[PDB]
Design a protein around this nucleic acid. Structure first.
Lengths: 141, 149, 28, 129
RNA sequence: ACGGUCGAACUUGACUAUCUAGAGGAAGUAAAAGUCGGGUUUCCGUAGGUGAACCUGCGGAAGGAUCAUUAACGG
RNA sequence: CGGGGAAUCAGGGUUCGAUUCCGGAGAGGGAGCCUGAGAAACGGCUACCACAUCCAAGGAAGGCAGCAGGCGCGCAAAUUACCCACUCCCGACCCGGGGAGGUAGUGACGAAAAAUAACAAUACAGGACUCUUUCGAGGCCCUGUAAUUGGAAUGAGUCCACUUUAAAUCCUUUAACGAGGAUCCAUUGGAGGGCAAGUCUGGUGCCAGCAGCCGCGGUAAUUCCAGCUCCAAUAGCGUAUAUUAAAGUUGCUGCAGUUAAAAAGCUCGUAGUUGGAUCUCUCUCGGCCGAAGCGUUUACUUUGAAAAAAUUAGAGUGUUCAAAGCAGGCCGCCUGGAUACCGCAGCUAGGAAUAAUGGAAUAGGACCGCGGUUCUAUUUUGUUGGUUUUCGGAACUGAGGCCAUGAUUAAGAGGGACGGCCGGGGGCAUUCGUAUUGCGCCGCUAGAGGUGAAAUUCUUGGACCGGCGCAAGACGGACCAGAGCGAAAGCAUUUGCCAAGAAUGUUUUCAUUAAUCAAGAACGAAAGUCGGAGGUUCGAAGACGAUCAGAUACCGUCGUAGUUCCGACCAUAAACGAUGCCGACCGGCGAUGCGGCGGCGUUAUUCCCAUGACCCGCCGGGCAGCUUCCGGGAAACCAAAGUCUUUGGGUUCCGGGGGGAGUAUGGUUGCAAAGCUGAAACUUAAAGGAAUUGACGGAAGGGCACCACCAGG
């Protein structure tokens, strides 16, 4: 049982911080290795250069080829696979162009069918995928 | 609950509610004190003096008859020894276990109980150092142990 | 990275490299 | 070992209140225990009692009515200022209409409403309802 | 100009830490349909058996499905 | 960088604070200085280092983390504009100057207000009031479709002017123009569930795609792509990320640890934390009062004064309302510009419960007086030089009186005595028992061994069997139990020694000495490792024999280390009650082990007395059990796993979805094996726990049938 005395504030705060280190979110936030392993470097978005297009197979009960691209981030050079969302949207991307990439949703976790993909593309050649898909703007090269 | 045992005994004395000297005890406080003096001259602990007075002379409680307890009467007269009774017996027990362990080398039970008796000695000496009955530099040593007894 | 002076030295090195590349591409 | 003899007393009183007994024997006794039971008596909660004097710490025989729901000690005796008494009587008491934080102050042992009247603070001992 | 002082910075070794070029080494991946083709109840610790698995030795657990019998005991 | 503060929030809390107010720091990096009231100043100087500018090649000049601007960097951020009019600052100064600051520009960071219609008549449509048996009949409102009409009312815009201002812009005030739906046209996300809103129509056909999560799509898709329609918020609405609440999933309030994640093998022990009853204001100086001590000291509580402004709360006040602001109101006056909060520490003055602590026990203890020794009185010896003025004050002391002279009690706290016992508790020595194995001799025979079958093996140089002995090493059965002892691991042949130990008994003694424990220590099955000794049995490795489409484990014979001892290491177990320790309370019962008490009887061949063995009851600590709707719990179950949202007795270790993994790496310990401490990247939507039904059983028993069989045609 818990110590409950009047002069036990040191034991209580010491025990709380040691046992705080056993939480998954607390350790991911405060130990410093998750921020050094994060490709985005703790940023909401990052810009990169497309290296390859790649077709990634959906996890077992779904059967599809999810269209992704392999990008290399500008600021650190780390390599990323990023999903291109809507249908036909892969045809807007060519090789070696700037791509703005955001998170997919689950803060570093794979989302849905796509295995190992944490990222989705947001912009190509500084026009959004949404305006390109709905035909609101055109991309230069 | 014992301090170093898993047992929980209830064996102990129960004083009566009557704190008065009984009528049939025809002893003054002076004669009881003098009896304590001669028993100390024979050479005994205060516990033994209390037992001898209880068994043979009808003195149910010395501090109800004289108004003081036995070791205080001894200390005021000057017949109390320098180290206390319980501590002296603890040291004597530890000395006996030490002698037995110098005899027998493979006895681990004796080594365990020896550790327990040393711990009792240290706790009692710590208490008597606080109360200034022992000198502050008093210490129990493994080697100079039988010199005290 | 460790050792704050070392990671600041690493950053200064990388700044020098990239800035040398920029000064290369701007003379042409 | 035994610490907090008030805790022992209040626990034995509660455990006989749940079983619905008519009298409780609490041993050992204290001045703090006697002042607590007096406060519980003056609101009609505990009922009239006896102190048995053995020449050691006494015993108390408490006659019980079926009125006490919970009798409790708060340990340690936290320092309760008058500005933080409201949070205490929100945490411990079931209603704003009844129930009592017993606290000891330099005016004596009282309940919280008397401490509001006498304008003092003290250390928390318990609560009963 | 002598001397002192404060003292940037330099040179030389050690201890480092980083950045950046690299002959070669050892891999996988995609392209070659090319060539050849029965047993265990469930465990634990330790040791051996080619690393582990698994099996055996030794000591432990149940976290493994109690039927039947039981009054005399004296001469 | 720190504070003021900010976001969130029941209460407790978590997180942020580069950033305009206060403080510090620095001008590319160091270092040194001049001047001066003030600088280690950089819109000063001197070097070095790193950059870099102009050169006629000798030399010369540098410092935007000021305002604007540029490059670079990136997910991420404005004009190379106007003015000293305001606020203020400097100077010799009513006058000069100010990228301070003010003003516009950019500006969906964010906050406030607020359009995109309103109305009437007609045509259908409901719901009401009156009259009617009802149908119905009306004058009462309401509603949209209006692929119906109609004029009224407005700003958005275009635009004179005034106003504003340093000059302007904007707002406000105002002329002229400005509205019928093909305009002056609202978006962004959704429509299976969570979660409001379609099982509509076409396309697609596990593709393309969707889908935070569960999932949808493989030819009837409520989920994709579309069309229509509906839903939500709305001048905004989606997404990514950090962070807060949800999270009682970090738990002080307030979690958990038998079986789900989880209590250390055991005990000792220091720090730390916690700790049982007990005790109801006055002598001197000054005017009944002020000064002087207070009172052992605090902790606690209440008061007071101090605690920047802005912020926050909040008073007043029609900024056209509001967010704001600090103003305003009345016919020269009247007023405002409050107040609270402001941890902790520190000053202050009351309270005295709670909690620490002290006050006399070798009495060199108080309070009075009677005295001594030494050091001192700053005035009374008119003016004096004085040996002495006296008086009075401080420190060491001799007896005396006086105090009711002075020691809370003896914890169903603990230690220590003492008493008679008790036990597979431990150590050393000693005694015995069989059996096994080997050896000797004797008897009789050809088999014996092993298996599901065999085979390997032994064996007429005589096995196996039977007898008499001898030795070696092991092991202490049955008696042996839910019996005992120990801290746990553990512990069973006799006898003797050795030292311990629980319980019980006690009108014994001490008097709080205690509980739980970081650190540190002792012991710790089996296996294993170093040295010596020994080897009977068994036996990992290993050898054979058997066994098969593919057998390399099972099985049998043999057998090494080991198994045994002595001295060292090792420190692990399903080291289990898968259940910390100490204290308290909450139902019952009779068996048992030890100790004690009370009592008829039977027994020691009727015992002569106590004593043992039994019998009946009580008490205390034990090992367990049964019974119970105590109350708990996911339940199974549990008198603890209870006394828990009516949540606080003290304290120790320890868990936080499954894996990666008790893995890597470092440290430490060990001869080694390994032990202790112990990650992350990554991966995943469930792993797990307690119950509940009974498909199918290659599970078992039965019954029936010439569309089953038997004997036949």
């Amino acid at each position: 049982g818990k110590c409950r005395g009047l002069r036990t504030a040191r034991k209580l705060r010491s025990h709380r911080r040691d046992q705080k280190w056993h939480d998954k979110q607390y350790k991911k936030a405060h130990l410093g290795t998750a921020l050094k392993a994060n490709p985005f470097g703790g940023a909401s978005h990052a810009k990169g250069i497309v290296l390859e297009k790649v077709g990634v197979e959906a996890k077992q009960p779904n059967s599809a080829i999810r269209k992704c691209v392999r990008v290399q981030l500008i600021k650190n050079g780390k390599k990323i696979t990023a999903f291109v969302p809507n249908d036909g949207c892969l045809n807007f991307i060519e090789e070696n162009d700037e791509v703005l990439v955001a998170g997919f949703g689950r803060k570093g976790h794979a989302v849905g069918d796509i295995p190992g993909v944490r990222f989705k593309v947001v912009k190509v050649a500084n026009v959004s995928l949404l305006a390109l898909y709905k035909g609101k703007k055109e991309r230069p090269r | 609950g014992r301090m170093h045992a898993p047992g929980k005994g209830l064996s102990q004395s129960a004083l009566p509610y009557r704190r008065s000297v009984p009528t049939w005890l025809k002893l003054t406080s002076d004669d009881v004190k003098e009896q304590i003096y001669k028993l100390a001259k024979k050479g005994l602990t205060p516990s033994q003096i209390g037992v001898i007075l209880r068994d043979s002379h009808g003195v149910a409680q010395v501090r109800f008859v004289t108004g003081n307890k036995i070791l205080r009467i001894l200390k005021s007269k000057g017949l109390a020894p320098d180290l206390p009774e319980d501590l002296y017996h603890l040291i004597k027990k530890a000395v006996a276990v030490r002698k037995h362990l110098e005899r027998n080398r493979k006895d681990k039970d004796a080594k365990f109980r020896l550790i327990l008796i040393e711990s009792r000695i240290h706790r009692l000496a710590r208490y008597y150092k606080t109360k200034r009955v022992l000198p502050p530099n008093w210490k129990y040593e493994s080697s100079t142990a039988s010199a005290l007894v | 990275e460790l050792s704050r002076v070392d990671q600041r030295h690493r950053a200064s090195q990388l700044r020098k490299q990239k800035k040398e590349a920029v000064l290369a591409e701007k003379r042409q | 070992v035994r610490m907090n003899v008030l805790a022992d007393a209040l626990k034995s009183i509660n455990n006989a209140e749940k079983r619905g007994k008519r009298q409780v024997l609490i041993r050992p006794c204290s001045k703090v225990i006697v002042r607590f039971l007096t406060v519980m008596m003056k609101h009609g909660y505990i009922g009239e009692f006896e102190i048995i004097d053995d020449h050691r710490a006494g015993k108390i025989v408490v006659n019980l009515t079926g009125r006490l729901n919970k009798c409790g000690v708060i340990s340690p005796r936290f320092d309760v200022q008058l500005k933080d008494l409201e949070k205490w009587q929100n945490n411990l008491l079931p209603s704003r209409q009844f129930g009592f934080i017993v606290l000891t102050t330099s005016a004596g042992i009282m309940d919280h409403e008397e401490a509001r009247r006498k304008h003092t603070g003290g250390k928390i001992l318990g609560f009963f309802f």
